[PDB]
Amino acid sequence: YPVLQKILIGLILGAIVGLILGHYGYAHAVHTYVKPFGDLFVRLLKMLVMPIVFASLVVGAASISPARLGRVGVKIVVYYLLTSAFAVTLGIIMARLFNPGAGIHLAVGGQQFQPHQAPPLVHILLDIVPTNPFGALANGQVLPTIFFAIILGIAITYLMNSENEKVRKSAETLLDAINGLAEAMYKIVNGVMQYAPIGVFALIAYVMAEQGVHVVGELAKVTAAVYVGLTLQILLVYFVLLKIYGIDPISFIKHAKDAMLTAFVTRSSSGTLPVTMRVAKEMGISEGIYSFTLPLGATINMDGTALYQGVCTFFIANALGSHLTVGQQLTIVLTAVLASIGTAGVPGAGAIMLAMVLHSVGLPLTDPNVAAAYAMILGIDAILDMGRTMVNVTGDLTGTAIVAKTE
Amino acid sequence: YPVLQKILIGLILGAIVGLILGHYGYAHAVHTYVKPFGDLFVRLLKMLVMPIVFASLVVGAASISPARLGRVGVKIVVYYLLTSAFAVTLGIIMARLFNPGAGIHLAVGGQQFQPHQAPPLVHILLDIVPTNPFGALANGQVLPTIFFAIILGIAITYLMNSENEKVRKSAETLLDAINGLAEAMYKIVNGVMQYAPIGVFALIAYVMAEQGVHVVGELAKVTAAVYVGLTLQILLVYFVLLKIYGIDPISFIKHAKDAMLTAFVTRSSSGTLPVTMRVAKEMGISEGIYSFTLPLGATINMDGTALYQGVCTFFIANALGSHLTVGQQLTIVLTAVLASIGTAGVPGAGAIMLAMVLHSVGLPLTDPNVAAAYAMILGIDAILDMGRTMVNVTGDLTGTAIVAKTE
Amino acid sequence: YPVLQKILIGLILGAIVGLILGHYGYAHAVHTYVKPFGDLFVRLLKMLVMPIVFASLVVGAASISPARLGRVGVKIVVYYLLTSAFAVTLGIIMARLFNPGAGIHLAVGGQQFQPHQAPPLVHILLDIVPTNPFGALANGQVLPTIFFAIILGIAITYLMNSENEKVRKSAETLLDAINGLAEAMYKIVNGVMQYAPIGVFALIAYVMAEQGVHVVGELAKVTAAVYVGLTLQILLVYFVLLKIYGIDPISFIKHAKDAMLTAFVTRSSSGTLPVTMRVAKEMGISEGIYSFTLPLGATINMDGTALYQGVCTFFIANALGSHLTVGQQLTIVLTAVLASIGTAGVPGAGAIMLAMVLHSVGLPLTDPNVAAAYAMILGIDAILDMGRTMVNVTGDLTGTAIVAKTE
Ligand SMILES: N[C@H](C(=O)O)[C@H](OCc1ccccc1)C(=O)O
Ligand SMILES: N[C@H](C(=O)O)[C@H](OCc1ccccc1)C(=O)O
Ligand SMILES: N[C@H](C(=O)O)[C@H](OCc1ccccc1)C(=O)O
């Protein structure tokens, strides 16, 4: 079987056969038939995310405790914050280049219930230190898991340096077992990726059926302004920073191919952690960097979302007719990067970041005009999700590759 | 101590001392006193179910991946479906041989709230793939655990055949650790089984006290119609299929003794998984079969239940006086087997399988007449439960032994 | 760094800097600035409790199954019950010595909703057997964890004495891995303790700011009675039971220093289990004993709390001016120890014990006279909490040290 080129065969063939069933009216025929097979690929990928993160990090933290992780962390965080600053500013620039929401229309009535406010920042940061590390594992919670795997990984290094060889014996057993699990999930990530072409096919067969035949109108200018923005993010920020650190862009892209396409159809950043990690091991990076930077990046580094929040804020302010302060769009840029940090763990964050970025400008989702305009964006949001998720994993790999060269 | 005949001693003694306290009115004195000792034995048994299943299946998947597990799995499923088909039809045949519900009385008022409808089949089948496999373990969920153990066990076998002997070194360590846990619970099961005769005593001391002195009247005909059906299930379908597959029935029965009797007093098919599994290993069956077919069978193969649903539907339709379609009791048979698959994981399925098999014939529990008659069955439901749970586990062992001979 | 004296340098400075901020109004400034650092420390400790308890007890159940554990447990329980009986009677004796509640004022009408009643005893005991051992781990549940670790450890020992060396091979592998984790958590308890000085400083900085400057008046007589009582507990019961058992009290206090001081600033018996456990290991005691008698003591042996319940009953009855039965304060003492067994696992028990000790005397929290007095105590409750939690862990160490010398 061709494989990995079979995904692309299923991608193009699906996107057309869904789009054809979309304009013909069979959107909810696809939902009750084709979709479950596309979900199956997502479920199987998600299955691996917890073991592969915990395992490959305890193993990963056999690596110079402070000088690595500490400086790796500091660099990857400084990378993440600056790329997200670019992402939003390019989204603003693209929404001034285009004009999404030219028509001051939009009928008013039937709208948002306003997402719950982000928890106090102190109670977000204090929460990266888990209280029951079995608990964190037992339900999602990547951030407390990252903390625990590093603190266990550093301890088990300090254990294998013990002058007692019952201590250095038992510590070696545990680490190997945990490494067993690590390697096991990477073997299943090859299995789950064999089903990908059936899953990929069935995923865009639904997105193009339910939201594709709705991409026309003023919303076409949104989808274009976002996607051109996302393309320019890839070329202007990723390729340039990749070149300026001496790692070949196309050799990077050839390796990233698997992780990119699963992120594009899964529309889950943390969901495609197993594929983005395997693609980083397959890329030659050590587990001391990638086992840490990738899951952290699937939680803080949202470049595609930060760009989408650029153009979405403008859209709504254009749908109402707000002047957007001839000078103070630097507030939309500031609280878009501050959103990612102050939302960190808190689940369903994509809706609550945009909520506080829209409130930052002065367009709360509570005023029925702002909300009716946001409602029209949500008619084509799965289309925009694909492109923005795909950039959310690119930044992860790109930052991981830069930290790999520096450290 | 005599032991394993100590169970039979406590059973006969307990059932008499329960039944004697039953007709003397001290049913709630047994609830508040004898009962907890019966609960302890169930608690301790349940305790081992999660580790023993997960452990002995990762270990269990050290066995030719496709040709075994696949064909094992296909056979056992084809077995399960056809045994469930016989069971319901034998229940129909036993309900036409007897006449449960001769009196068209039953006073109306005070009945069911109608159980929750079974989740859409695609969100039951997709649910067999877990998302957080640690979470699967964290709270019950035998089905997604089975899927993960097997997917881990296939991964850990492919890992051991690697040309790198750091990867095989770490694979072996993990497998053996997991196998430590496997053997651990099996050694515990021997202990918990030493408490069995006290637990056994205290359980039928309750069931006969609370529902025993209630088994008189038209309900005696039901209990006789179900139990003669359960006896004939073992004799006509198990002892025939066992013999026709070249394994001695009595040699099988002698080995099944422990598993049979705890299932009869626990009334939990998954609850007596460690005893049915220990009895399978002690039977000499390999972990490549029994470690997969037994926890699957405590979730799909409910022959005793499917048989009970035959006579229960007939009881309600005779209480009302419905004709039961002179020909179309095939619809009762059909939806009984399709209840087992379409319920799978979903908790409290015993009521929801019967809710839809009754709805299939045309007797909804929403109708105050149907539900008034169904309320009378529940007054002797734990009497019926013992017999049906005991046949639920037999077929799991019977199927396991048939697959062992075949594969 | 000086260390373990840098804790003391922070405690004194923090107690004065909180107290100074308190009588100057800036209590709620300290809550929103200093307090988080104090929390970080407590979160970090609580993080270890669940692995450290489970691990160092499967490993700790490498030791003569019955003769040890059985007799160990039966000693430590009889120990626990007698020390808790002393504590409450030293509470009554210190409350008759002082007179907390001279003034029969207290204005009425702003009071307690009455804490949920303690679950029936049989469902407390039956609940010490967990039903899903992974469950118990995944969420708190120190008692059922204890029961699983001990039943695992007994089984893994019997497993290691098998004439087959595939079973003995795997059991040894499992045990080392579990011990890998055991060791690892201790290595971490050294790191988490390096943060203690800052954590300690920020913790009394709070309690002295929010409840310090409220310690004046008739509540001063309370605080004094309790603390004098708790001091007289340590001198008269621990140092006397230590001496009489042949373990130098001051050498014991040199060793207990770390666990004593964190229990005082954390106010969490079970939260400082890691510091109490490493200080038992570093004391030279065996995992056979300490690994079982320490968590079981952070769940039954609240000496300092049962002392408080003595003087609190008196204060409330003094506030109302009840005679406290010229004789029947024995019923306070009796139900005070029963409270500890009869509350076991059941969370929030602290209040739910005081509830029933007060109801025992005959002053339910529901009488808005009793309740208006009880809410006055709660004003200086964190101040009393420190002193009593530190006496709650001392008894756990003291018992373990007595049982070590005996067994
Ligand atoms: N679907 C996107 C992704 O997974 O990258 C993402 O939605 C999910 C999400 C993931 C992480 C944090 C917040 C929200 C987004 O659109 O921002
Ligand atoms: N007690 C029986 C068993 O566990 O086999 C069974 O109850 C539980 C159950 C198990 C599986 C599916 C439905 C219901 C029944 O009463 O039919
Ligand atoms: N601080 C005490 C302790 O942890 O020992 C304790 O407070 C916490 C607690 C512990 C156990 C049950 C309920 C509440 C008490 O005052 O009884």
- Measured CA to CA, the distance from residue A144 to residue A137 in angstroms comes to 9
Task: Please report, for residues A23, B203, B208, B210, the alpha-carbon distance to residue B25 in angstroms, rounded to integers and kept in the order given.
Answer: 72, 17, 12, 9
Q: Residue C404 phi/psi, 5° resolution?
A: -65, -50
Q: Are C47 and A130 in contact (CB under 8 A)?
A: yes
CB-based contact B152 A188, cutoff 8 Å: yes
Of the candidates B39, B180, B191, the beta carbon closest to that of C170 is on B180
Three-state helix/strand/coil letters over C41-64: HHHHHHHHHHHHHHHHHHCCCCCC
Q: Are C14 and C201 in contact (CB under 8 A)?
A: yes
CA of A202, closest CA in chain B: separation in Å? Answer: 15
- Measured CA to CA, the distance from residue C223 to residue C383 in angstroms comes to 8
Which residues, at least 6 apart from C199, have a Cβ–Cβ distance to it below 8 Å? C37, C38, C40, C41, C42, C44, C265
Q: Are B339 and B274 in contact (CB under 8 A)?
A: no
Q: Are A89 and A310 in contact (CB under 8 A)?
A: yes
Tokens coding A220: 């076409």
CA of A169, closest CA in chain C: separation in Å? Answer: 8
- Measured CA to CA, the distance from residue C120 to residue C141 in angstroms comes to 18
* Ligand 2 pocket, residues with Cβ under 6 angstroms: B 267-269, 302, 305, 349-350, 353, 385, 388-389, 392
- Measured CA to CA, the distance from residue A59 to residue A186 in angstroms comes to 14
Of the candidates A137, A138, A171, the beta carbon closest to that of C183 is on A171
- Measured CA to CA, the distance from residue B89 to residue B347 in angstroms comes to 25
Choose the mutation target among B34, B41, B139, B181 for the interface with C, i.e. most C CBs under 10 Å: B181
Max distance between CA atoms of chain A, in angstroms, equals: 76
Phi/psi region, residue A129 (left: phi>0; alpha: psi -120 to 50; beta: rest), is beta
Of the candidates A131, A155, A167, the beta carbon closest to that of C47 is on A131
- Length of chain C equals 407
Task: Please report, for residues A53, A143, B143, B144, B323, the alpha-carbon distance to residue B148 in angstroms, rounded to integers and kept in the order given.
Answer: 16, 23, 9, 6, 47
Residue with tokens 């065969």: A9
Of the candidates B284, B288, B263, the residue with the CA atom closest to the CA atom of residue B394: B263
Task: Please report, for residues A305, B193, B350, B400, the alpha-carbon distance to residue B276 in angstroms, rounded to integers and kept in the order given.
Answer: 52, 12, 21, 11
- When computed from its CA atoms, the radius of gyration of chain B, rounded to whole angstroms, is 22
Resolution value in angstroms? 3.2
Q: Are A406 and A245 in contact (CB under 8 A)?
A: yes
- Measured CA to CA, the distance from residue A390 to residue A263 in angstroms comes to 5
CA of C112, closest CA in chain B: separation in Å? Answer: 32
Residue with tokens 């989204």: A91
Residue numbers in the known binding site of B for L-aspartate are: 267-269, 305, 346, 385, 392
Report, in this order, helix, strand and coil percent for chain A, each rounded to 5. Answer: 75, 0, 25
Q: Residue A121 phi/psi, 5° resolution?
A: -60, -40
Residue nearest to atom 2 of ligand 3 (CA): C389
Named by the residue before each, gaps in chain B exceeding 2.5 A from C to N are: none
Of the candidates C138, C180, C191, the beta carbon closest to that of A156 is on C180
Q: Are C177 and A173 in contact (CB under 8 A)?
A: yes
Alpha-helical segments (H) within A284-348: 287-297, 303-320, 330-341
- Measured CA to CA, the distance from residue B225 to residue B313 in angstroms comes to 13
C309 lines ligand 3 (CB under 6 A): no
- Measured CA to CA, the distance from residue A350 to residue A174 in angstroms comes to 38
Residue with tokens 């649910």: B127
Tokens coding C88: 């409450």
Residue with tokens 């060793």: C255
The distance in angstroms from the start CA to the end CA of chain B is: 39
Q: Residue B292 phi/psi, 5° resolution?
A: -110, -45
With b for 16 or more beta-carbon neighbours within 10 A and e for fewer, the A316-327 pattern comes to: bbbbbeeebeee
- Measured CA to CA, the distance from residue B58 to residue B180 in angstroms comes to 12
C378 lines ligand 3 (CB under 6 A): no
Residue with tokens 């003087």: C311
Three-state helix/strand/coil letters over B57-114: HHCCCCCCHHHHHHHHHHHHHHHHHHHHHHHHHHHHHHHHHCCCCCCCCCCCCCCCCC
Residue with tokens 């001034």: A96
Total Cβ atoms within 10 A of residue C2: 9
Quote the number of domains for chain B. Answer: 1
Centroid of ligand 1 to alpha carbon of A389 (angstroms): 7
Which residues, at least 6 apart from B86, have a Cβ–Cβ distance to it below 8 Å? B233, B237, B303
Q: Does A232 touch chain B (CB under 8 A)?
A: no
**Burial category of C288 from C-beta neighbours within 10 Å (exposed 0-12, middle 13-18, buried 19 and up):** buried
Report, in this order, helix, strand and coil percent for chain B, each rounded to 5. Answer: 75, 0, 25
Of the candidates B70, B138, B58, B126, the residue with the CA atom closest to the CA atom of residue A45: B126
DSSP at B159: H
- Measured CA to CA, the distance from residue C196 to residue C189 in angstroms comes to 10
Quick check: helix, strand or coil at residue B214? helix
Task: Show contacts of C158-165: CB within 8 Å, 24+ apart.
Answer: C158/B187, C159/B180, C159/B183, C159/B184, C159/B187
- Measured CA to CA, the distance from residue C202 to residue C10 in angstroms comes to 8
- Measured CA to CA, the distance from residue B240 to residue A25 in angstroms comes to 55
DSSP at C271: G
Q: Are B282 and B324 in contact (CB under 8 A)?
A: no
- Measured CA to CA, the distance from residue C359 to residue C61 in angstroms comes to 41
- Length of chain A equals 407
Q: Are A289 and A406 in contact (CB under 8 A)?
A: no
Of the candidates A263, A267, A54, the residue with the CA atom closest to the CA atom of residue A142: A54
Task: Please report, for residues A146, A215, C135, the alpha-carbon distance to residue A51 in angstroms, rounded to integers and kept in the order given.
Answer: 12, 39, 17
- When computed from its CA atoms, the radius of gyration of chain C, rounded to whole angstroms, is 22
Ligand nearest to the CA of B46: 2
Of the candidates A258, A262, A239, the residue with the CA atom closest to the CA atom of residue A250: A239
Q: Are A299 and A213 in contact (CB under 8 A)?
A: no
Q: Are A115 and A353 in contact (CB under 8 A)?
A: no
Quick check: helix, strand or coil at residue B262? helix
Tokens coding C273: 């289990």
Tokens coding C365: 């929290």
Q: Does C179 touch chain A (CB under 8 A)?
A: yes
Residue with tokens 């409130």: A359
DSSP sequence for A198-254: HHHHHHHHHHHHHTGGG--THHHHHHHHHHHHHHHHIIIIIIHHHHTTT--HHHHHH
CA of B146, closest CA in chain A: separation in Å? Answer: 13
- Measured CA to CA, the distance from residue B102 to residue C376 in angstroms comes to 70
Tokens coding B394: 């037999």
Closest residue on chain A to B174 (Cα): A177
Q: Where in the sequence is the domain holding A106, given as residue range(s)?
A: 1-407
Total Cβ atoms within 10 A of residue B367: 16
Q: Are C365 and C112 in contact (CB under 8 A)?
A: yes
Tokens coding B338: 């399709």
**Burial category of B198 from C-beta neighbours within 10 Å (exposed 0-12, middle 13-18, buried 19 and up):** middle
DSSP at C98: S
Q: Are C75 and C292 in contact (CB under 8 A)?
A: no
Q: Does B132 touch chain C (CB under 8 A)?
A: no
DSSP sequence for A3-53: -SSHHHHHHHHHHHHHHHHHTTT-HHHHHTTTHHHHHHHHHHHHHHHHHHH
Max distance between CA atoms of chain B, in angstroms, equals: 76
Q: Are C153 and A146 in contact (CB under 8 A)?
A: no
Helix axes C167-192, A142-159, angle to 10 degrees: 100
Residue numbers in the known binding site of C for L-aspartate are: 267-269, 305, 346, 385, 392
- Measured CA to CA, the distance from residue A223 to residue A229 in angstroms comes to 10
Residue numbers in the known binding site of A are: 267-269, 297, 299, 301, 305, 343, 346, 385, 392, 396
Three-state helix/strand/coil letters over A159-179: HCCCCCCCHHHHHHHHHHHHH
- When computed from its CA atoms, the radius of gyration of chain A, rounded to whole angstroms, is 22
Tokens coding B233: 């299930």
Which residues, at least 6 apart from A67, have a Cβ–Cβ distance to it below 8 Å? none
Say which CATH number the domain at A358 has. 1.10.3860.10
- Measured CA to CA, the distance from residue B230 to residue B234 in angstroms comes to 7
Of the candidates B51, B42, B53, B52, the residue with the CA atom closest to the CA atom of residue B195: B42
Task: Show contacts of A177-180: CB within 8 Å, 24+ apart.
Answer: A177/B170, A177/B173, A177/B174, A177/B177, A177/C173, A177/C177, A178/A54, A178/A55, A178/A58, A178/A59, A178/B174, A179/A55, A179/A59, A179/B170, A179/B174, A180/B156, A180/B159, A180/B170, A180/B171, A180/B172, A180/B173, A180/B174, A180/B175
Give C212's Cβ-side CA count (13 Å radius).
23
Identify residue B199 by its one-letter amino acid code.
G
